[PDB]
Amino acid sequence: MEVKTIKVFTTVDNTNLHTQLVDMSMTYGQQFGPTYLDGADVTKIKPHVNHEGKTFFVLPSDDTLRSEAFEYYHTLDESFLGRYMSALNHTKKWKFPQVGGLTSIKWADNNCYLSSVLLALQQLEVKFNAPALQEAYYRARAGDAANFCALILAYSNKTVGELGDVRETMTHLLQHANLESAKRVLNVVCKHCGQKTTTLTGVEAVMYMGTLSYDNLKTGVSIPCVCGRDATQYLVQQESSFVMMSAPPAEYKLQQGTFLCANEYTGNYQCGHYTHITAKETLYRIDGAHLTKMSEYKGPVTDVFYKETSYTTTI
Ligand SMILES: [Br-]
Ligand SMILES: [Br-]
Ligand SMILES: [Br-]
Ligand SMILES: [Zn+2]
Numbered sequence: 001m002e003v004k005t006i007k008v009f010t011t012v013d014n015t016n017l018h019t020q021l022v023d024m025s026m027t028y029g030q031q032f033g034p035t036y037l038d039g040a041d042v043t044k045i046k047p048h049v050n051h052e053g054k055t056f057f058v059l060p061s062d063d064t065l066r067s068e069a070f071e072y073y074h075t076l077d078e079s080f081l082g083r084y085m086s087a088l089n090h091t092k093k094w095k096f097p098q099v100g101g102l103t104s105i106k107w108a109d110n111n112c113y114l115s116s117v118l119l120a121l122q123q124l125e126v127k128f129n130a131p132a133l134q135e136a137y138y139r140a141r142a143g144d145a146a147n148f149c150a151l152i153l154a155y156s157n158k159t160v161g162e163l164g165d166v167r168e169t170m171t172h173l174l175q176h177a178n179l180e181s182a183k184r185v186l187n188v189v190c191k192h193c194g195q196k197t198t199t200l201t202g203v204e205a206v207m208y209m210g211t212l213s214y215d216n217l218k219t220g221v222s223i224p225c226v227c228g229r230d231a232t233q234y235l236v237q238q239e240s241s242f243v244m245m246s247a248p249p250a251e252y253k254l255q256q257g258t259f260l261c262a263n264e265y266t267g268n269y270q271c272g273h274y275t276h277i278t279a280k281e282t283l284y285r286i287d288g289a290h291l292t293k294m295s296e297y298k299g300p301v302t303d304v305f306y307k308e309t310s311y312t313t314t315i
Contacts, residue, residue, distance in 0.1 A: 006052040010035075012065050012081055013072040013132070017055060022047045032058045034082050039089040057085055073151075074130040074176070080154055088150035090160040096145045100284040100291045103143045104276075107288035112274045113164035114149055115288055116263040117173065119276040120166075120305055123261050125241035126177050133176055166263055166274060166303055167209070167246045174203045182206050185237035187315050190225045197236065197315070206240045212247050212262075214306045238311040249300035256283060256295065262304040264297075277301075 004024045009017040010032060022028065028035035029043035036042060036057040059081050060069040069075060073084075095106035102122050105115035122141055128134045133151055140148035156172045158164060184205035189195045208217060220232040242260065249265045254277055261278040275287040277297050285292040 006047050006049060008047070008051055008053065009055045010058045011055055012058065012060050012069045014055070014057075015072075016068050018064075022051075028056065032056070033061055034059050036082075036085040036089075039085050039092055041085070041089070057081060072130070073132045075155075083157075083159075084150055084154040087153040087160050088146060091146040091149040091153075094146060094149065095289070096140075096143055097289045098143055099286050099289060100278065100280065100293075102278070102286065103140055103145055104286050104288060105145065105149070109161040110163055111149070111160075112288060113166050113169060114152060115286075116166050116274045116276045117152065117169050118145060118148070119278065119286055120170070120244075120261050120263070120303075121173075123278065124305065124307075126174075128176050129178050130176060163269070163272065166265075167207075167244075170244065170303075171203060171207065174206070177203075179203060179206065179240070182240040183237065184235070184240070185315075187234045187236045187313075188223060188231050189234065190227070190229060190231040192229060193225055193227055193231070195315075205238075206242065207244050207246070209246045212245045212252055212301055212304045214243055214245055214259075214304070217243075217245070218311070234313070234315075235311070236313045236315045238308055240308050242305055242308055244303060244305050246303045247301075249302045251298060252301040253296065253298045254279075254283065254301060254304070260305045260307045262301055264299045264301045266300055 005021040008020055008022055010020050011017050022031055024047045027044055027046050034043050037054060059078050060066040073080060094108050096103050097106060102119055104119060105111050118140060128137060136148040136151050152173055153160060155176060156169060179202045182202055182205040184200040186198045187195055217235040220234045223231050223233045225231040254262055256279055259279060263274050263276045265272060265274050267273055275285055278284050283294045283297055285294060285297060
């Protein structure tokens, strides 16, 4: 005969708050659907008096929340908020030490691929379209990356603990970056057939699988011609702030003054592990919270990043 309530706020973006009166005799789940407090799932709990005035994250369940979720995350999937919160409940527990002047991630839950992605991004000029990513990234660069890591996992449909691949993760993450002005032009030349250019834009303009060497794209890559002879594919225009060269792991030597940063993959499956290498006053090998300085590195490199502004040949 009496409904006892506490006033709380619900939100999907942490800026637009919606006042709610929650009945203390019912769970949060019964009233709001899946609910989270500071990332912890409180769906099955009934309101505590001390929850008064606190802000809870909920799934976008009405027009207003859906619009707020889209504007902030650029997502239409209602479950996104749940997967983000689920991941954040874990990543908020991770440690993000400064290692060699960069924000790294202390090893946990097979997060070494995420640590490599984060280390590389900090060294590139890149900006994201979604406010949520932009903001989370600003924080990660400063040394606080729990939110950024959870968003990466949520956007890529991977869970904490799941094995990851740097190239695949970067690909999915760069699809959320503003690469509108990224452009690559290749010229394929055959002694007998002639020449033809291929233009690529966006993510495809900055990534390449097959060789770790940016110089190799410039010198030319052998390719089969429709006729049957061997043609040469040359990079003739590259307009981007960086390029990422990838290849299946194989012994490769990284030398100072020739690249921006890179990562190597040692082992397979349960023993597979990534470490990052960056070029500073000397080479730095960043392995989670561990730093090793060396004049050169030879190991199973799988991705190498290079800085760029504009590269063009006569064609
Ligand atoms: Br998760
Ligand atoms: Br940004
Ligand atoms: Br470079
Ligand atoms: Zn030909």
